[PDB]
Predict the structure of Glutamate receptor, ionotropic kainate 2.
Amino acid sequence: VLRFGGIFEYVPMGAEELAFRFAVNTINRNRTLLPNTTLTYDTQKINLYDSFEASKKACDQLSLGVAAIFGPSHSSSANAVQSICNALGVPHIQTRWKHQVSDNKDSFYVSLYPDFSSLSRAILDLVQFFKWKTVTVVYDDSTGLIRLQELIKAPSRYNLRLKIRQLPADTKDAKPLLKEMKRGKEFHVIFDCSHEMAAGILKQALNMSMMTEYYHYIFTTLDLFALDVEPYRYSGVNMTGFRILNTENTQVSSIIEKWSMEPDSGLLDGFMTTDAALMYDAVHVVSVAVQQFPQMTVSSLQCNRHKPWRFGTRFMSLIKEAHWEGLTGRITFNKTNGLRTDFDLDVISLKEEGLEKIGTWDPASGLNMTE
Amino acid sequence: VLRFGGIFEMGAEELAFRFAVNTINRNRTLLPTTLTYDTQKINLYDSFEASKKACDQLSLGVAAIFGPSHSSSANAVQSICNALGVPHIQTRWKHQVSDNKDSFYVSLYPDFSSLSRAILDLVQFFKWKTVTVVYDDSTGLIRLQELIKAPSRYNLRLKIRQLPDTKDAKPLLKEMKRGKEFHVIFDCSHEMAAGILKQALNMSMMTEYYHYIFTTLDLFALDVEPYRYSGVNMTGFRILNTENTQVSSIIEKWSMERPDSGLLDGFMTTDAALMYDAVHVVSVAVQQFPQMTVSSLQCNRHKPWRFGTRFMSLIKEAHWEGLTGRITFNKTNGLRTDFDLDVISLKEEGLEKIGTWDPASGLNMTE
Ligand SMILES: *[C@@H]1O[C@H](CO)[C@@H](O)[C@H](O)[C@H]1NC(C)=O
Ligand SMILES: *[C@@H]1O[C@H](CO)[C@@H](O)[C@H](O)[C@H]1NC(C)=O
Ligand SMILES: *[C@@H]1O[C@H](CO)[C@@H](O)[C@H](O)[C@H]1NC(C)=O
Ligand SMILES: *[C@@H]1O[C@H](CO)[C@@H](O)[C@H](O)[C@H]1NC(C)=O
Ligand SMILES: *[C@@H]1O[C@H](CO)[C@@H](O)[C@H](O)[C@H]1NC(C)=O
Ligand SMILES: *[C@@H]1O[C@H](CO)[C@@H](O)[C@H](O)[C@H]1NC(C)=O
């Protein structure tokens, strides 16, 4: 019997927090996992973008005695708990993308979120398939540039002429930006934002008769198809994106169901995000690591009192090597970056019947289209 | 008599800090009071060690911490400073976040959105149609983003590359030479720059066809001797007013205290000059607040700093003529968005001021 850690936003409850609890409870029930063990956990609710509070709440979970911390979903917060985890030798489990640094030499952490250099290369692979010559990439926050940088420096190695814009704070302030694209005849567009931001801008692009067949939008969000695309079914507009969540598999469909069993924004109700799906998978991927390490026993470690974690290098090694078929498909880590650089995607596009798989992608095979 | 804080990777910023408080002590005009300080040497890119060393300086009792010169390290001490209400003094650019609501901090480094707008103002003056922007690390994209999204509002067609090893820049140079990319912007440290110029030279890439612009403000602490009569054009900016002799003599007694790399020996970087100015800009704030007294504050024991909101207010309002010119802060971002630059270019006599710039006036060229 051992304990896990968790840090989530403070507020109604969070979707990642529920995917975490729900995950350890189905690990308890399921015989195959922990036939001689039981998962308990400790939840901490911190105000995000607060490195200090995240570090303290982290140290409280460390003295309490955890085998791994599932840190916050933010840049600053996650970097703090990542450094504390690397110091005291306790594994850090990130479920989102954060800006990494070459200088940084932390090793006690892994990220289940699909390496975003693989996704940027999948996007341009999709632009190659569409034979696009021009394209306007519009991002939400500045980190978007660091994210899909492999796409930004394609025009230098390729024959591409892409403009690049950004949208302000207000959601509905996207109309002026849309006026400039409409006016600039920029029909091929990539959007770097959350599926919520996306559903919001599509509702405005619609008001600006911008949903014709001339336009073709690609989306960064993997939760693209948790969107109510009903209003744009027969508008003639094309839309494409990726999906790492294998909802095609019924095992995944039933898990998503018992999870959803527990407003007019444009989103569909009763859906599981990839952030929630990645937290659920994280719990399972670390459960298979501890499964191969029956001699595990948490320990009370203090931040002020320097003291590495006993079974750290061993546990972290079993985690970076773990291969697990989860909701998001085959899960494996780049031995160098402990970063998930190899994964399977399903390219999907809007049709007159709705969004549907038109092919697959992956860093290896490249781009396979079911013509 | 009060104490200051400092965190560094001896270093040039650390010496500019000590040197700064010692000249504040000597100089009558300031502290007619005495400055003592506490130095901490942390391994950079270590949020944890930076937070602990910071809390040790907080319990010790400081009036302000001059945090580390890194993203992660500076964000940690920035959050701790905002919590315990002690002013944070950053001297470099770090990626800021809209969500972040910390207020106890200011950055003397010139707002990099003003510099990105000065760069394109320079590209407008040169009437460049094409241009290849090559950055060093990924944060460069976030930095000069105001330039990257110019092609959408303007008539510009700029490529964009990244460099990996210093000497591994040759393949990148082959692609530019081959792609006829003569107009080039470089986003890197003056050390990286001096290194790539030495290679561009070996590749007969220093002709009059090429024209390089540089992000580094320490551009002209470079040995540009080998490219004097090569015919190549080179341009950059300078916020350090070495033209002013007061600044020239300070830089001198500084270089009196402390390899074939392409750099010039005995120079003061803008990072060191900004630390020196920081100490003075915060000294003028405490000068207008004689009722100041440091306090021992604990991290585990929540307790804001008494004269925090007041001190931080006197600092964000402080106007000070320093080594880097007039220093003032954007009331909203506590970020130095208004400053004076001196555009400089390589001639047959060497680098020299060919004009000035600033967010207000725009671009003034001494034709
Ligand atoms: C679109 O939005 C405008 C306001 O921006 C509103 O006045 C108009 O009724 C809308 N047009 C339609 C028919 O959707
Ligand atoms: C692992 O990381 C290296 C270096 O970033 C990268 O080149 C490689 O593609 C990654 N591994 C895989 C198979 O994705
Ligand atoms: C440039 O570098 C090459 C390879 O090291 C060297 O052989 C050559 O002499 C250099 N060019 C000159 C003229 O210095
Ligand atoms: C560089 O400067 C000289 C000054 O005479 C100018 O004639 C030339 O056009 C410039 N080089 C470029 C980039 O054209
Ligand atoms: C401060 O920054 C804002 C952008 O955040 C800018 O619009 C404003 O002009 C700056 N303050 C002034 C008036 O100098
Ligand atoms: C242009 O520079 C001159 C000095 O050469 C300066 O006196 C003048 O104020 C500048 N013009 C303006 C106001 O932009």
